[PDB]
Amino acid sequence: SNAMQAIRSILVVIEPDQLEGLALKRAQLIAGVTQSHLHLLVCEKRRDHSAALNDLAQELREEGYSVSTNQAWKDSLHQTIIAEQQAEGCGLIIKQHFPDNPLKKAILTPDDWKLLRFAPCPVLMTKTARPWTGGKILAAVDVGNNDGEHRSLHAGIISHAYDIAGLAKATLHVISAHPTFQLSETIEARYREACRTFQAEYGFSDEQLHIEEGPADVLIPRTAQKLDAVVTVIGTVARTGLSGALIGNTAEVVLDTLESDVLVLKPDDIIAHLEELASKE
């Protein structure tokens, strides 16, 4: 329930030429409550943004924030971001989504996909300009699986989601999607007993907990849209797929579809291995 409070530095990706600055707005809301440090990063080689960065940092410090800034560039946008996260030890990366195609506005750019694949920490991809305050926060889990790996991921998802609901004075909602009649009737009864246990463990009301049958890759966005969720918290697949496919189909589809901000968490052992990879560089 305190996963956000426990994040002590946030890497804020600052864009030089856009007309929205949602990454910094989300960071200000969060740090306003958690008092996390904010490290502002511009990823560019050409222009000297130092004066603008200093002015911005001074304004934020006067507002009471702990702030550092930097401008860097090595190789690619996502690589620059991850190198900065490593150098500053940040526990969250916040970046605004800016689609390449105006006709496919929900699809993440290929570079942002690389960021999500390799970041060894939670990544908040902002996708809406709607304020978090008073909104609806949606946590996506699979109550149908309670093995050690899923319990851990789910606990993380709920912890971050609940902490967000708290800091934003918002409400918390949960979606769980799950893919001879006598036997089916018996198996489903047992699945329901497990949902009830999950509901008691996590103190969710019937109204908060959406238990839906069908493909998670459609159910999660359906629920987000119906709730007009402003943030959706999701986990990547517990076990990586072939050829380093560590995001998984559900999260891939959901990230390219949601209109809400998306907080992307990974399994602890995945994070550990990505931490190792990010360190080699």
Ligand SMILES: [Cl-]
């Ligand atoms: Cl941290």
Ligand SMILES: [Cl-]
């Ligand atoms: Cl906000």
Ligand SMILES: [Cl-]
């Ligand atoms: Cl992947």
